Design an enzyme around this catalytic site. Structure first.
Site, PDB file in Angstrom:
ATOM      1  N   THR E  55     -80.769  53.738  10.628  1.00  0.00           N
ATOM      2  CA  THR E  55     -81.795  52.798  11.084  1.00  0.00           C
ATOM      3  C   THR E  55     -83.180  53.197  10.590  1.00  0.00           C
ATOM      4  O   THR E  55     -83.909  52.351  10.063  1.00  0.00           O
ATOM      5  CB  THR E  55     -81.783  52.634  12.601  1.00  0.00           C
ATOM      6  OG1 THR E  55     -80.443  52.319  13.033  1.00  0.00           O
ATOM      7  CG2 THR E  55     -82.757  51.542  13.029  1.00  0.00           C
ATOM      8  N   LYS E  84     -98.087  67.761  25.141  1.00  0.00           N
ATOM      9  CA  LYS E  84     -99.292  67.754  25.960  1.00  0.00           C
ATOM     10  C   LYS E  84     -99.121  66.861  27.182  1.00  0.00           C
ATOM     11  O   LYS E  84    -100.047  66.702  27.964  1.00  0.00           O
ATOM     12  CB  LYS E  84    -100.507  67.322  25.126  1.00  0.00           C
ATOM     13  CG  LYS E  84    -100.843  68.246  23.933  1.00  0.00           C
ATOM     14  CD  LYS E  84    -102.085  67.746  23.135  1.00  0.00           C
ATOM     15  CE  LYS E  84    -102.351  68.651  21.925  1.00  0.00           C
ATOM     16  NZ  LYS E  84    -103.518  68.195  21.071  1.00  0.00           N
ATOM     17  N   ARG E 105     -87.526  53.566  18.093  1.00  0.00           N
ATOM     18  CA  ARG E 105     -86.270  53.844  18.795  1.00  0.00           C
ATOM     19  C   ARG E 105     -86.567  54.854  19.900  1.00  0.00           C
ATOM     20  O   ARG E 105     -87.382  55.767  19.695  1.00  0.00           O
ATOM     21  CB  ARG E 105     -85.244  54.435  17.823  1.00  0.00           C
ATOM     22  CG  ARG E 105     -83.996  55.056  18.521  1.00  0.00           C
ATOM     23  CD  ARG E 105     -82.947  55.436  17.489  1.00  0.00           C
ATOM     24  NE  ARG E 105     -82.303  54.242  16.948  1.00  0.00           N
ATOM     25  CZ  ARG E 105     -81.158  54.253  16.272  1.00  0.00           C
ATOM     26  NH1 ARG E 105     -80.540  55.400  16.019  1.00  0.00           N
ATOM     27  NH2 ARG E 105     -80.631  53.118  15.847  1.00  0.00           N
ATOM     28  N   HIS E 134     -80.182  46.531  20.351  1.00  0.00           N
ATOM     29  CA  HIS E 134     -80.315  47.046  18.990  1.00  0.00           C
ATOM     30  C   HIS E 134     -80.355  45.810  18.101  1.00  0.00           C
ATOM     31  O   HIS E 134     -79.407  45.522  17.368  1.00  0.00           O
ATOM     32  CB  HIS E 134     -79.109  47.932  18.651  1.00  0.00           C
ATOM     33  CG  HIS E 134     -79.292  48.804  17.445  1.00  0.00           C
ATOM     34  ND1 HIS E 134     -80.287  48.605  16.512  1.00  0.00           N
ATOM     35  CD2 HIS E 134     -78.588  49.887  17.019  1.00  0.00           C
ATOM     36  CE1 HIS E 134     -80.187  49.521  15.559  1.00  0.00           C
ATOM     37  NE2 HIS E 134     -79.159  50.308  15.841  1.00  0.00           N
TER      38      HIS E 134
HETATM   39  O1  LIG Z   1     -75.076  55.299  17.462  1.00  0.00           O
HETATM   40  C1  LIG Z   1     -74.158  54.442  17.351  1.00  0.00           C
HETATM   41  O2  LIG Z   1     -72.957  54.810  17.520  1.00  0.00           O
HETATM   42  C2  LIG Z   1     -74.461  53.004  17.043  1.00  0.00           C
HETATM   43  C3  LIG Z   1     -75.867  52.791  16.558  1.00  0.00           C
HETATM   44  N1  LIG Z   1     -76.034  53.483  15.323  1.00  0.00           N
HETATM   45  C4  LIG Z   1     -77.140  53.358  14.439  1.00  0.00           C
HETATM   46  O3  LIG Z   1     -78.098  52.621  14.690  1.00  0.00           O
HETATM   47  C5  LIG Z   1     -77.064  54.147  13.177  1.00  0.00           C
HETATM   48  P1  LIG Z   1     -78.277  55.499  13.183  1.00  0.00           P
HETATM   49  O4  LIG Z   1     -78.310  56.198  14.512  1.00  0.00           O
HETATM   50  O5  LIG Z   1     -77.924  56.509  12.044  1.00  0.00           O
HETATM   51  O6  LIG Z   1     -79.693  54.900  12.869  1.00  0.00           O
HETATM   52  C6  LIG Z   1     -76.894  53.141  17.574  1.00  0.00           C
HETATM   53  O7  LIG Z   1     -76.902  52.509  18.668  1.00  0.00           O
HETATM   54  O8  LIG Z   1     -77.753  54.048  17.350  1.00  0.00           O
END
Ligand SMILES: O=C(O)C[C@H](NC(=O)CP(=O)(O)O)C(=O)O
Ligand SMILES: Nc1ncnc2c1ncn2[C@@H]1O[C@H](COP(=O)(O)OP(=O)(O)OP(=O)(O)O)[C@@H](O)[C@H]1O
Ligand SMILES: Nc1ncnc2c1ncn2[C@@H]1O[C@H](COP(=O)(O)OP(=O)(O)OP(=O)(O)O)[C@@H](O)[C@H]1O
Ligand SMILES: O=C(O)C[C@H](NC(=O)CP(=O)(O)O)C(=O)O
Ligand SMILES: O=C(O)C[C@H](NC(=O)CP(=O)(O)O)C(=O)O
Ligand SMILES: [Zn+2]
Ligand SMILES: [Zn+2]
Lengths: 145, 310, 145, 310, 310
Positions: E55, E84, E105, E134
């Protein structure tokens, strides 16, 4: 070719077990003449494995272990080219050293003792009760560790 | 000599009904008439490789009440096994050149049995080996049941909680099965059920047992309600949904209990027995613990003395 | 007994090597009939091992993999009961799959790849160079799976 | 296309003398006449799974000097390999759908080679794989030796320190062995000696090499003194006697050095080169590091751009 | 302006079918005819507070392919939130004075939504918020389903594994439910079932769905088999029995698969897809990951550029 004068013929071994016995009993660690048939036809069981060894006999331990690996196998003892003794291997009451207790928290894994299991013939599978942890298992679970 | 003189005490499975009765009779006599010099000149090892409060302390107190001396450790971290890589085998090999008996608790099943193979003429007493056996708990449990119920046969006994990992109930069920007409009720999460080898034993002896999803289901008929702790230190991570007590006995649950019924628990409890139970006439887990003194004295006396006259 | 109509006969295997060949190349993992003679008298070799596998054939590459263990062996291809081809193993360029790299820090132990070693003559020994870590070892210390 | 266009750059053992000369020729050209847009519209992954200052920062600076963009990470801890259990194979399989090249350093030997088996048409440039290879170090080293000595043939080259685990010296020895008449002096603790596969290769080519137990033995004849750090992060615990540098070069050690002699070190240094060396005319480890820009620009250009630069 | 210009992209539940089709149409155009300078003079923050390979790297690669610059972090440990004690609110309040968009994220559900309440006129794009949403995964997933199946309507879609914590399947199910005639098969451990708010939504729209305990049950009818990883980092300890994958797809399982069927997986995979699947014509998880570039380019273009691309 060259039937043997004195030694052992292990017959009626299930398919895919002959090779295993060769390893487990270290039978090929000898200079004695050996012949082996794998996937031989058998009226008695469709297919079978077969092991012939000159001038050599199974040790008491090996006979005991054979009853576990191949119950329906036949142990033929030969002298002067003749079958002198014939029997399916006698099941023992205990079997030591060779088996591994599937209980991961068994003391037997961490310590210098020989494994030991109470062997009792049962209806469908055979039961192995560990001397140490007192747990009992099907030999199917104990074997193929 | 007496049947238990110089015997290892590892598993209830190696003891007969007569053996158990002998310990109970001896415990009754010591409770009535103490023998402060019975084990004079004995030195006993108390070797605990996992945690204990009741089992270690009552054992050592018992040794002192009979006049014996005590050496050992309550954890293994400062033994040579803990710091220098020494095996348990060798540990037993040297300690058995020092003492007259070895009491040991250990986190691996089979450790006590293994100890007997290196201790020579020195008797080993199993104070708990992993989730396998706990024979002295069973001795004090039987003693307590006999005291409060007047008998060890024709009982209605419920065992609740973690029966899979409870070395307490493995030993207790085996012992009670050596008596006649007992009836068992097993109340446990599916994941922590009474193991099959116990059940098969009960079947082979034609002993009646049944499974139940609640205490109230059997409350009106039990003489002994034996509660247990979830053995979280034994659980596989796949079994962590079961860490909380599934069954919680509260005072209000006892309303239809038999008058004579006792609530036992080998202890410690977490939440499976609420504190409002403590004041009820049915609570007997502290008296039960107190009885560890007389059972463990009895056992020590019988193992280390050829005969006793009292 | 009972000669084969088609398959492969691996003849003139040195003593103590027949069993190793069976283990390593998984030769008994099949339903085809196998015949094995160990410690057979040879005359040329004095003592030899002999492997007979029905309905099964070895490519030139497969034959070459034997060179490490039985460089002087003869591989007989059998068809219609006759020897239609005789070949001797020649040292291969690579040994893939069967061996394990002795280097504990090699990526091959952690990841979904097959093992691979370049083969070369060094003095009177055989040196194996791992495709991944590029470290090189005598074939004696490179263990099998 | 130029002979290195779209090639993986994994091991010096895979490259020819002509390949090495090509990089150096290209490095010279780009240094004289920068081409700030040569790799415009390229996106290159910089994937470091173990520590780096020089190699990562010079590679990224080189990408930017040529107009390319950069994505990646300097730590594996927050990739999905780090936290979710992903294999390196799958990591490469996805990254190779994003970028035009992958530069990677990794703590396991063979990692870069493995990456090539999953990167499809995307070139992998090995920025170091365990104690195995470090081909771009060798390219800047050769550029630096050429710059200061005027040639890569008929040189006296001493390599000092941890030769067993030095990926730098594995690569550099293999490279200089492709030129004629070079002579090697290896000065290492016995436990950290140059590996046999390097020595065999030298013997094959008929190249003179010898072991020495001191720097002073060889100082009067060396053109290049290549010092190395003990690779403590690669050592087995059984090799811990060699953590400390066994050979320490100080300014006073340089009295009988040839006027042309340069002291090189791939860096970082701990104590194997005293700071008093820094000011002497023989010190060239920082100039050496700065040449990483020209070597790494050249390599990127050759791998990612079809036409030869002029 | 296009309907997505300057919009926050937080949850698929907030988007319409028309919005989804717009992204896909834009993705197709940019893939056919790249616009390497479309977002020149934009600076975009890439703020990852939990692990990521695909991602983060695909988003940043997309920004670079469109000419934008990137700032941010892949780890929160060295932000002022990390060391901090700063709130996420204040973190967003300052970053939103620097950049033209924020991609984030975060391990807590709701984080992206919270960011929108502090980012002023700066759009927030949710790259994943705990086990909630997501949405950019869903955009690439839809692109991939469309590419391989030729439509997003009237499909048989199986989703397998951890549906409770899979933000991927929450978003994708909500998205496919906006198209007509799709049918869902849910293959999950009971403890990790698809959440009721998803199921209620399906029932509302009159969409057929059903639970199944094996992959084989449904293999003959599925167009898309969507495999997922057990979200072990989201599990309560009481759910630890489900850490291991309950359903493992191997190449042999695919005998009765429809010719058109594709196996998808948002990745990373542990063991739920055996490596022998990789070479079969049904494996499309890596192609899927590569489509993240086209989907993420399209979204950036739509959010940051006023005019529709053509
Ligand atoms: O982690 C998973 O299994 C599915 C999904 N995976 C991804 O987005 C791929 P990554 O973590 O490499 O960016 C997520 O929700 O983070
Ligand atoms: N002298 C010998 N040398 C080698 N093998 C022999 C010799 N004598 C017998 N055998 C082998 O031992 C096995 C048992 O021989 P036996 O003569 O008992 O056959 P059988 O009566 O069919 O036995 P079973 O009823 O157990 O199958 C046969 O497989 C036979 O080939
Ligand atoms: N139809 C067959 N079935 C089983 N074994 C066979 C068959 N044909 C040949 N063999 C075996 O193949 C080997 C070689 O056979 P061949 O007829 O070439 O003997 P040879 O010429 O003495 O061999 P070499 O000269 O290579 O030692 C012998 O061990 C023989 O037992
Ligand atoms: O721990 C339990 O729950 C039951 C039982 N408890 C005891 O023996 C009491 P203690 O651990 O205080 O000696 C045991 O098996 O150890
Ligand atoms: O680390 C060394 O001592 C030599 C060599 N050093 C470098 O490449 C410099 P850096 O680790 O800063 O990128 C290496 O093998 O990594
Ligand atoms: Zn055991
Ligand atoms: Zn290797």
């Amino acid at each position: 070719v060259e039937a043997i004068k004195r030694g052992t013929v292990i017959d009626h071994i299930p398919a895919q077990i002959g090779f295993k016995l060769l390893s487990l009993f270290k039978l090929t660690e000898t200079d004695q003449r050996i012949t082996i048939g794998l996937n031989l036809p058998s009226g008695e069981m469709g297919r079978k494995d077969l092991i012939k060894i000159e001038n050599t006999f199974l040790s008491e331990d090996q006979v005991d272990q054979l009853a576990l690996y191949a119950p329906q196998a036949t142990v033929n003892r030969i002298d002067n080219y003749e079958v002198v003794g014939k029997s399916r291997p006698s099941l023992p009451e205990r079997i030591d050293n060779v088996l591994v207790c599937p209980n991961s928290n068994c003391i037997s894994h961490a310590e210098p003792v020989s494994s030991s299991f109470a062997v009792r013939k049962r209806a469908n599978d055979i039961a192995l009760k560990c001397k140490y942890c007192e747990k009992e298992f099907s030999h199917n679970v104990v074997l193929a560790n | 000599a007496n049947p238990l003189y110089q015997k290892h005490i590892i598993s209830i499975n190696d003891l007969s009904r007569d053996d158990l009765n002998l310990v109970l009779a001896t415990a009754a006599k010591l409770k009535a008439n103490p023998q402060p010099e019975l084990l004079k000149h004995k030195v006993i090892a108390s070797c605990f490789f996992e945690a204990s409060t009741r089992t270690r302390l009552s054992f050592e107190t018992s040794m002192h009440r009979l006049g014996a001396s005590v050496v050992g450790f309550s954890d293994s971290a400062n033994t040579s096994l803990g710091k220098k890589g020494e095996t348990l085998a060798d540990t037993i090999s040297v300690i058995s050149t020092y003492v007259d008996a070895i009491v040991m608790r250990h986190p691996q099943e089979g450790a006590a049995r293994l100890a007997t193979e290196f201790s020579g003429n020195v008797p080993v007493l199993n104070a708990g080996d992993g989730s396998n056996q706990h024979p002295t708990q069973t001795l004090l449990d039987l003693f307590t049941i006999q005291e409060t119920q007047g008998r060890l046969d024709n009982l209605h006994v419920a065992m609740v909680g973690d029966l899979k990992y409870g070395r307490t109930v493995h030993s207790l069920t085996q012992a009670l099965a050596k008596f006649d007409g007992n009836r068992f009720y097993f109340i446990a999460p599916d994941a922590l059920a009474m193991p099959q080898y116990i059940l098969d034993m009960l079947d082979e002896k034609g002993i009646a047992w049944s499974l139940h999803s609640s205490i109230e289901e059997v409350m009106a008929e039990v003489d002994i309600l034996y509660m247990t702790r979830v053995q979280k230190e034994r659980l596989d991570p796949s079994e962590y949904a079961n860490v909380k007590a599934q069954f919680v006995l509260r005072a209000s649950d006892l309303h239809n209990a038999k008058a004579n019924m006792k609530v036992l628990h080998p202890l410690p409890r977490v939440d499976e027995i609420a504190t409002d139970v403590d004041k009820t006439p049915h609570a007997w887990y502290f008296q039960q613990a107190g009885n560890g003194i007389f059972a463990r004295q009895a056992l020590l006396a019988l193992v280390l003395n050829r005969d006793l006259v009292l």
